[PDB]
Amino acid sequence: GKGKPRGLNSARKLRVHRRNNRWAENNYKKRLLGTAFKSSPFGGSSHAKGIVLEKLGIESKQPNSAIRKCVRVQLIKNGKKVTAFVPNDGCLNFVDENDEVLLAGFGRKGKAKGDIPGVRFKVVKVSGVSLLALWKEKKEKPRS
Amino acid sequence: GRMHSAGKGISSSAIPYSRNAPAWFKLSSESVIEQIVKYARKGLTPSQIGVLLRDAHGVTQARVITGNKIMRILKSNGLAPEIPEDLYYLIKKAVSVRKHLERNRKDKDAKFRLILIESRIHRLARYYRTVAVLPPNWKYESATASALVN
Amino acid sequence: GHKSYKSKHASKGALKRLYKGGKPDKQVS
Amino acid sequence: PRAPRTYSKTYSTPKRPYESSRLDAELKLAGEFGLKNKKEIYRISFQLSKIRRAARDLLTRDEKDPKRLFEGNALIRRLVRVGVLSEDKKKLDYVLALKVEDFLERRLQTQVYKLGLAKSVHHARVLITQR
Amino acid sequence: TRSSVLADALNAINNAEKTGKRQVLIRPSSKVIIKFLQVMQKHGYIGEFEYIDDHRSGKIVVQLNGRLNKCGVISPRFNVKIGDIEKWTANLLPARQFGYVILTTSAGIMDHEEARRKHVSGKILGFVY
Amino acid sequence: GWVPVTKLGRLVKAGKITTIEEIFLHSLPVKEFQIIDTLLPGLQDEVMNIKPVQKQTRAGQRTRFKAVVVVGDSNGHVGLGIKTAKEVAGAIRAGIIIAKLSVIPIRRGYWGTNLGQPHSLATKTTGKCGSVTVRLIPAPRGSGIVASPAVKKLLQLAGVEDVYTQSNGKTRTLENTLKAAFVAIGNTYGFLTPNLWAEQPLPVSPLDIYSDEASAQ
Amino acid sequence: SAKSFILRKKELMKRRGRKVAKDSKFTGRKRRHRF
RNA sequence: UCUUGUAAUUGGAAUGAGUACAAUGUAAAUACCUUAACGAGGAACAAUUGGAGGGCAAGUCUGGUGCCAGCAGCCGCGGUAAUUCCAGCUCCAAUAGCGUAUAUUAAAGUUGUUGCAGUUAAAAAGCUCGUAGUUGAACUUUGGGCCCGGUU
RNA sequence: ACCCACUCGGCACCUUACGAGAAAUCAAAGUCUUUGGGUUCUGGGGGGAGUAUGGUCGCAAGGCUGAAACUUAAAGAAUUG
């Protein structure tokens, strides 16, 4: 019993039944539709490059609050637009309009340390130098 | 269980564990064969012949006494019917229920029962035509089968 | 109390109480 | 259009990275033998894992199999030539029962300390490195 | 219907073992059930069995004595290459030193260690330990 | 000084009973924890979990302490203790008392061929308590007790050395896992091997033989 | 709300009988800033 | 009476990173192998990358900034949906490497042939008939005897 | 017609756990980590959604088949006051 075929010559039924079931997967469905090439922000990539379109001070709360605010960037290959989290404060003075930034993905979230509403693109580089090395005064941001 | 139903009865017969010669019978082995011949000349179906034999003359059944079944005796003497007993009775049942359904056009139960009877006929007729008792087509139709049975 | 009715797709009855208040699909060759 | 020189890696990172018993035993070994980092313990664990895998699928083969005879004799002869097993333990159930210290005892710094000449395994290693 | 007589025979023996009965009746019999029970009797896992003979297909009375852990059927009777045999044991036997998995080879109906001594293999039938 | 209050108490008090296999084979029951202390010494103890439990009345909220502990010396004899008392140390004492009262043994074995003082089990065995299932698999020599550190400690106090443990079920809980593992190792002792097919002498429950000096005063 | 979350999910651990860390002036602080 | 630790205590040893005659090396060179001579006393020839409520290893640390219709009164104390607002100390892991992003694999028995589940958690067609498809009762030479001959 | 004892086949019941389960409980939901008697359909976190598009039956009402983007860390069984 158990609700499946079990004959010695039933292998075709097991194959086809498994194919349909696999069509009710999630990652298989995302992959064999190739939807990581059509609707995703990245073209299936890891990073991407962009031009900072607008910067807004989206504070956590009203003035006595946490400084985690960021920008909307335009993708340079796709032409799409997306918000893209600048990291820890004191780096917003690095970022103004038109800075040719490099974006990556975000990753995880806990009950602290950033539970931002869907802003999942941490900026890795600004002006093609760095953001961490620019933060530790290792290098200076070039003038245009 | 039943082939077309939910019931699971087990009412049947039970042949004894004695393949030989009931002791008190001691009558004959061929004489009963000409009462087979006589009754088949009368026109009785083999089930009827068996039941009249065990009700009248003390024959338990012909397979143990004669050494042959009834149909091979009837076919041996050439009195075998064209289509066998059971298929003929199924066709007769289907015919009668279709005439009643012809008269009474609203009876959904007879329509369902007739579909059941037709499917039972089809299974049996396919069995017969794959064992070379009917011609290999035999074309069971809904109307002309009436002329086949009566 | 009473246990709520359970269904993956919302009933056509409940949608009537919800709803009161051209081009085909693309296939890039 | 020239062939590859083949390569592999002799070390293997552990499955659960952060276990106080494992960290403690690793640091105990490092102090007792004078190692540079955890890669040495990992490398001996990889060597031992290969040897135990060979021993397991040799023993699952039947007794008196010719492949079992040849490969087991080669393996046991090798591991007594390097001197990890004893002289009178030439059987496969014993080479299932090998410990990492039984391999680190047969190194160079452990021998050039144990044979005198160094009075300390750390001094032994730095005396090796200085040729 | 009764798609396999070895299956329900082995199931009946196992329910009679789990409950704590003494002897069990099996309907119907087969050649392969006789030979299976022959091997199981030879290895001591059951008591002694006796074939009640009517003309239909018979029945079997198996006189148990405890000391049997489990018996079962592996359906469908998969083809078993010889090197596959070990793998099959490691799938469904409680250990390697004890337990048996039973093959039907052309050299007869016979358990796996004798299948290796006679150096032959064939289809699988079931198992017992 | 401990005074016997039962039949096996009088049996063990004068030291006429020393071998624990007579107790195990006929399954002699025990209701006082002093029997194993006067019979098997050195039983190392270690604590699993002490947690506060709340019972809510009409107005009040009574707080008790549930203690689970383990007992086992080094060699094939284990006991688990579930108790709940009004005090933490009293709960530990009661738990270790019931753990020493419910000691069960272990039949060990070899993973493969037989050589030199067995180190593992003899059969893959199941244990279940509330949607957790511990499956114990014998393992080769020096392979390490591959279990969770609580369960690894359990088999380390048991006496086995290498057991593969595929466990299936929601293992966030501790008590269900420990109860399932306890039943698993108990049925591991209860799993019959054909090696015990030899003829056994079948004693006549030797409390009957020692009934002259174990009866009432 | 980080401090209150740690306060909520630390007291639950003691009811389960699990050892929990002590509290001080290091609980609800950014232990390591990001990049 | 012999063993570990500490010290702005002290002493002499060793050696290559480097510099470089030379020679090997090479089609010619560079670099490796060998080597004349030089080359270690701490800010030297200075090791980093991540982290520290539990997962998951390591703070009953320090200091600073901002608000409080809270006590005091100009010293301050405490709180601060400031998700700490910012720095330092100490500790943990890996190490000439360490982190991050995307994809994938194991842990996953969340694709389950081995190996899932369907009363109530997602999930047994309203019911029956029926073709392809899957699956399908038992039985036909068994037993006994004979030798020869191989292996532990 | 009734009673008594059997037997086959039905509809429900009472108790129990030798078993099973997350639990309520269940002679089946038992004979399942000691996992294989035959077979058909269904399911893969919640929303978007029985929504969109196409096909199809339907006079109509409608039914049948039936997604995707996006978003989100959530969405059964008993006891205790």
Side-chain angles (χ1 to χ4, degrees), chain D residues 16 18 20 23 26 36-39 42 130-131:
Chain D
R16 267 84 183 173
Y18 280 174
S20 299
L23 302 174
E26 280 179 16
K36 199 190 162 180
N37 63 7
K38 312 291 203 71
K39 264 179 196 158
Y42 293 173
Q130 278 145 9
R131 299 183 54 185

Side-chain angles (χ1 to χ4, degrees), chain A residues 66-96:
Chain A
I67 306 105
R68 37 170 186 85
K69 42 204 193 189
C70 196
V71 310
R72 297 283 298 178
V73 66
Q74 183 144 290
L75 277 298
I76 191 167
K77 43 161 175 163
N78 291 319
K80 280 178 174 177
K81 305 189 276 294
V82 65
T83 187
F85 181 76
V86 160
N88 184 34
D89 69 328
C91 307
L92 279 166
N93 61 26
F94 307 164
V95 175
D96 62 358

Side-chain angles (χ1 to χ4, degrees), chain D residues 19-34:
Chain D
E19 288 275 2
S20 299
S21 61
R22 214 211 60 231
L23 302 174
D24 203 333
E26 280 179 16
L27 191 57
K28 193 168 302 176
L29 271 178
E32 211 191 79
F33 290 96

Side-chain angles (χ1 to χ4, degrees), chain F residues 55-58 124 126 128 131 135 168:
Chain F
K55 176 51 213 174
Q56 166 85 71
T57 52
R58 166 74 61 85
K124 41 200 80 184
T126 191
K128 169 150 191 292
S131 160
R135 217 191 163 274
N168 290 318

